[PDB]
């Protein structure tokens, strides 16, 4: 058969979700962004394409902050990255409200992962067109 | 909150030529029981604002969490969060007052009286009061509970009108605040000897004095009081 790539959450005969891979294609077409885990922390870096010199320098920030200890950078559709960061901020807020301590990095990672994966379960929603490098320092380093 | 349980008493504050000063005793009373000592009731918001809270301590901790999350959310996507777009005292107070009036209008009030003190970005002093009813007002001197009956007379002796603010040095204001705290310890049954004080000045930083104690207590004349009228020995 054919037509497997037209709808989201549809398995192809080889067991793939082609809409997710097209989202990955959209990601690869984005600007470069990297993260480096060091001995006692993390560093995030991103390239911002200066399309013209009419862009105000040092503005148009791409790196976003979650809570006060999590840093997130993304490549792909910037609006989808902002959406994912907002969801993660809500997750971190609820975690702090219930459990008092700021959300650990693995917990936050699983929150974001469950959100993104849920966006690949239904044909009524589009997969996320971003790849996200995030992290920070918690009680475990 | 439909009835307060663990409560905190007076919070007092006054303006002076360069800024504001605010004090509150470190006591959480459980009815008539001075149960919890060492309860910080002055919450610095950043480096230019201090919120003094009186009343239900659980609602005070709720307000603390709200202020923390407000600072956090102000930091989001805001490179000037440490500069031009930092949280101002007027912003924090208007948020608190909106919350208090909404809770009052839902018949579920935050059983507190709040004094937001600080210095604006333009150096202007901010000193305003909101309570569980949503009533808001500002004055050169502000006080909650018993302070509003006893501390305010002593503080208005120092700063009676707006014109007296530029004439009020920080030494005079701090001395007045400490004397008012001593008077409150004298005549308030739900007050503590230990208190905390906070000075927010436009020229220096935020100074947060903890573990202060009421001193210079006049009790000697009590040895000469005998009986309740006719007792001679």
* CA B121 and chain centroid, separation: 21
Taking contacts as CB-CB distances below 8 angstroms, the residues of chain A near B73 are: 89
Q: Which residue, B141, B144, B170, B165, is CA-closest to B154?
A: B141
Q: Output DSSP code: residue B166.
A: T
Q: Is B80 at the interface with chain A, CB within 8 A?
A: no
DSSP-derived 3-state class of residue B60: helix
Q: How many domains in chain B?
A: 1
- Quote the CA–CA distance of B219 and B176 in Å, as a whole number: 20
Residue A106 region by backbone torsions, left for phi larger than 0, else alpha for psi between -120 and 50, else beta: alpha
Looking up residue B20, the CATH number of its domain turns out to be 3.60.20.10
Say which residues have a Cβ less than 8 Å from residue B13's Cβ, sequence separation at least 6.
Answer: B20, B21, B22, B23, B52, B115, B117, B127, B141, B142, B143, B177
Tokens of A111: 């929150």
- Provide the domain limits for residue B228: 1-233
Evaluate whether B52 touches B177 at the Cβ level (below 8 Å).
no
- Quote the CA–CA distance of B129 and B120 in Å, as a whole number: 16
- From A70, which residue of chain B is nearest by alpha-carbon distance? B76
- In chain B, which among 29-68 make CB contacts under 8 A with chain A? 65
Evaluate whether B49 touches B92 at the Cβ level (below 8 Å).
yes
**Alpha-carbon gap: B109 to the closest alpha carbon of chain A (Å):** 20
Say which residues have a Cβ less than 8 Å from residue B40's Cβ, sequence separation at least 6.
Answer: B26, B196, B210
**Alpha-carbon gap: A121 to the closest alpha carbon of chain B (Å):** 30
Residue-wise DSSP of A42-91: EEEEE-----STTSPTT-S---EEETTTEEEEEEE-HHHHHHHHHHHHHH
Q: Which residue, B46, B40, B48, is CA-closest to B8?
A: B40
Q: Which residue, A57, A71, A61, A81, is CA-closest to A129?
A: A81
Closest by Cβ to B69, choosing from A58, A61, A93:
A93
Q: Which residues of A18-53 are buried (b: 16+ CB within 10 A; e: fewer)?
A: bbbeebeebbeebeebebeeeeeebebebeeeeeee
Tokens of A7: 């709808």
How many alpha carbons fall within 13 Å on the CB side of residue B92? 35
**Residue B47 neighbours by CB distance under 10 Å:** 14
- Quote the CA–CA distance of B169 and B176 in Å, as a whole number: 11
H or E element in which residue B190 lies: none
Tally of helices (H runs) and strands (E runs) in chain B: 4, 13
Residue B156: C-alpha distances to residues A54, B55, B68, B140 (Å):
56, 24, 33, 8
**Residue B34 neighbours by CB distance under 10 Å:** 14
Q: What is the resolution of this structure in A?
A: 3.0
Evaluate whether B53 touches B43 at the Cβ level (below 8 Å).
yes
Bridge partner residues of A2 (DSSP): none
Taking contacts as CB-CB distances below 8 angstroms, the residues of chain B near A65 are: 75-77
Task: Decide if B77 and A67 are in contact by the 8 Å CB cutoff.
Answer: no
Q: Which residues of B175-188 are buried (b: 16+ CB within 10 A; e: fewer)?
A: ebbbbbbbbbbeeb
Say which residues have a Cβ less than 8 Å from residue B48's Cβ, sequence separation at least 6.
Answer: B86, B87, B88, B89, B118, B119, B120, B200, B206
- Quote the CA–CA distance of A16 and A51 in Å, as a whole number: 36
Taking contacts as CB-CB distances below 8 angstroms, the residues of chain B near A72 are: none
User: Helix A78-99 vs helix B57-75: angle between axes, to the nearest 10 degrees?
Assistant: 160
Bridge partner residues of A36 (DSSP): A43
Evaluate whether A111 touches A117 at the Cβ level (below 8 Å).
no
Residue A17: C-alpha distances to residues A12, A14, A21 (Å):
6, 9, 7
Q: Which residue, B65, B72, B9, B14, is CA-closest to B37?
A: B9
Bridge partner residues of A100 (DSSP): none
* CA B160 and chain centroid, separation: 19
Q: Is B127 exposed, middle or buried (0-12, 13-18, 19+ CB in 10 A)?
A: buried
Q: Is A139 at the interface with chain B, CB within 8 A?
A: no
Q: Which residue, B116, B59, B54, is CA-closest to B88?
A: B116
Q: Output DSSP code: residue A12.
A: P
Bridge partner residues of B128 (DSSP): B116, B138
- Quote the CA–CA distance of A28 and A22 in Å, as a whole number: 10
Task: Decide if B76 and A61 are in contact by the 8 Å CB cutoff.
Answer: no
- In chain B, which among 114-143 make CB contacts under 8 A with chain A? none
Q: Is B157 exposed, middle or buried (0-12, 13-18, 19+ CB in 10 A)?
A: exposed
Say which residues have a Cβ less than 8 Å from residue A2's Cβ, sequence separation at least 6.
Answer: none
Q: Which residue, A69, A65, A74, A61, is CA-closest to A27?
A: A74
Evaluate whether B199 touches B206 at the Cβ level (below 8 Å).
yes
Which residues of A are known catalytic residues?
Answer: 31
Expt. technique: X-ray
Q: Is B78 at the interface with chain A, CB within 8 A?
A: no
Q: Which residue, B162, B168, B170, B158, is CA-closest to B140?
A: B162
**Residue A98 neighbours by CB distance under 10 Å:** 7
């Amino acid at each position: 058969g054919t037509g497997y790539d037209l709808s989201n959450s549809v398995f192809s005969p080889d067991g793939r979700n082609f809409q997710v891979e097209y989202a990955v294609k959209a990601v690869e077409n984005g600007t470069t962004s990297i993260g480096i885990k060091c001995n006692d922390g993390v560093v995030f870096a991103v390239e911002k394409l200066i399309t013209s010199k009419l862009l105000v320098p040092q503005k148009n920030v791409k790196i976003q902050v979650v809570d006060r200890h999590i840093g997130c950078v993304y490549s792909g559709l910037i609006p989808d990255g902002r959406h994912l960061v907002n969801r993660g901020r809500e997750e971190a807020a609820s975690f702090k409200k219930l459990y008092k301590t700021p959300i650990p990095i693995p917990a936050f990672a699983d929150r974001l992962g469950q959100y993104v994966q849920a966006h690949t379960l239904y044909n009524s929603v589009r997969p996320f067109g971003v790849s996200t490098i995030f992290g920070g320092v918690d009680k475990n380093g | 909150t439909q009835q307060p349980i663990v409560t905190g008493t007076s919070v007092i504050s006054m303006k002076y030529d360069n800024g504001v000063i605010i004090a509150a005793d470190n006591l959480g009373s459980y009815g008539s029981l001075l149960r919890f000592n060492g309860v910080e009731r002055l919450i610095p918001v950043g480096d230019n604002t201090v919120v003094g809270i009186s009343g239900d301590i659980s609602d005070m901790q709720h307000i603390e969490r709200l202020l923390k999350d407000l600072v956090t959310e102000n930091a989001y996507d805001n490179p000037l969060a440490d500069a031009e777009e930092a949280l101002e005292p007027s912003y924090i107070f208007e948020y608190l007052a909106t919350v208090m009036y909404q809770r009052r209008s839902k018949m579920n009030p935050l059983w507190n009286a709040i004094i937001v003190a600080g210095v604006q970005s333009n150096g202007d002093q901010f000193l305003r009061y909101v309570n569980l009813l949503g009533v808001t007002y500002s004055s050169p001197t502000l006080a909650t509970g018993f302070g509003a009956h006893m501390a305010n007379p002593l503080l208005r002796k120092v700063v009676d009108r707006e014109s007296d603010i530029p004439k009020t040095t920080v030494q005079v204001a701090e001395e007045a605040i400490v004397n008012a705290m001593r008077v409150l310890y004298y005549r308030d049954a739900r007050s503590s000897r230990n208190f905390s004080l906070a000075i927010i000045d436009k020229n220096t930083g935020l100074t947060f004095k903890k573990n202060l104690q009421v001193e210079n207590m006049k009790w000697d004349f009590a040895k000469d009081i005998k009986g309740y009228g006719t007792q001679k020995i």
